């Protein structure tokens, strides 16, 4: 029942899902001042190499391109990770207007949108047992901010018109998620949450500093979207991002100096 609304959105979740006031919460606001560089994180791992993309995915609140999991061939690694970690999934959060989208911030900054590459560790076997961990699953952000194009999107942006309503979803096979990825891996990484319902305090969220660029025209199409279903009124796929929560007794390290 719950979405982004005035009605069922953020400030709502915590009567169907009480953690939403939990001490582990995501996203938050990256005080850049406050963090501190952690000599101790290895290098990070990003291995895409052999990812394979089966499905892209309206489900009623963004959209999910799916990857085959049965093997260990996307896989996150190094950071502050221990062991290895499966991608499962991306999708993005993003705003009606370009000030607004992300869901962490940096120094109280909202970008227009954010990707979130959603990783399982592989010691829990399968995603469902890796949501009751607290080290269950790991979460690389990239943020996205309006200007040239991004060309390894465009395959995403091309498709949606065919999944434009919840529940529709569309062959999407050989997307490579490494041209989503900007240059550097800098990064700030914290223990937090799912921020969406049911927002289980499972993540360790690595937060790419670089954000990538991404053209006016792809994030347009992002806003064509529908939150609704096929013959429904038309409630546009827009905001749906969770606002920054407490970081109460945590602290958000640095990869770079
Ligand atoms: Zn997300």
């Given at each position: 029942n719950w979405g982004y609304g005035k009605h069922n959105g953020p400030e709502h979740?915590?009567?169907?899902?009480?953690?939403?006031?939990?001490?582990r919460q995501s996203?938050?606001?990256?005080?850049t001042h406050t963090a501190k560089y952690d000599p101790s994180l290895k290098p990070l791992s990003v291995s895409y190499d052999q990812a394979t993309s089966l499905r892209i995915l309206n489900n009623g609140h963004a959209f999910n391109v799916e990857?085959?999991?049965?093997?260990?061939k996307a896989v996150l690694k190094g950071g502050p990770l221990d062991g290895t970690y499966r991608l499962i999934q991306f999708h993005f959060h993003w705003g009606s207007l370009d000030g607004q989208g992300s869901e962490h911030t940096v120094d109280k900054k909202k970008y227009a949108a954010e990707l979130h590459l959603v990783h399982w560790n592989t010691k829990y076997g399968d995603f469902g047992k890796a949501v009751?961990?607290?080290?269950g699953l790991a979460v690389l952000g990239i943020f996205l901010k309006v200007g040239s194009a991004k060309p390894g999107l465009q395959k995403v942006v091309d498709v949606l018109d065919s999944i434009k309503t919840k529940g529709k979803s569309a062959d999407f096979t050989?997307?490579?998620?490494?041209?989503?990825?900007?240059?550097?891996?800098d990064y700030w990484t914290y223990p937090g949450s799912l921020?969406?319902?049911?927002?289980?305090?499972c993540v360790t969220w690595i937060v790419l500093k670089e954000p990538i660029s991404v053209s006016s025209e792809q994030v347009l199409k992002f806003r064509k979207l529908n939150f609704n279903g096929e013959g429904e009124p038309e409630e546009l796929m827009v905001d749906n991002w969770r606002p920054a929560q407490p970081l109460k007794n945590r602290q958000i390290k640095a990869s770079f100096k």
């Open positions: 979740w915590h009567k169907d899902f009480p953690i939403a006031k939990g001490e996203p938050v606001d990256i005080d990857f085959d999991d049965s093997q260990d009751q961990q607290p080290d050989n997307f490579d998620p490494r041209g989503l990825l900007p240059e550097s891996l921020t969406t319902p049911p927002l289980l305090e």
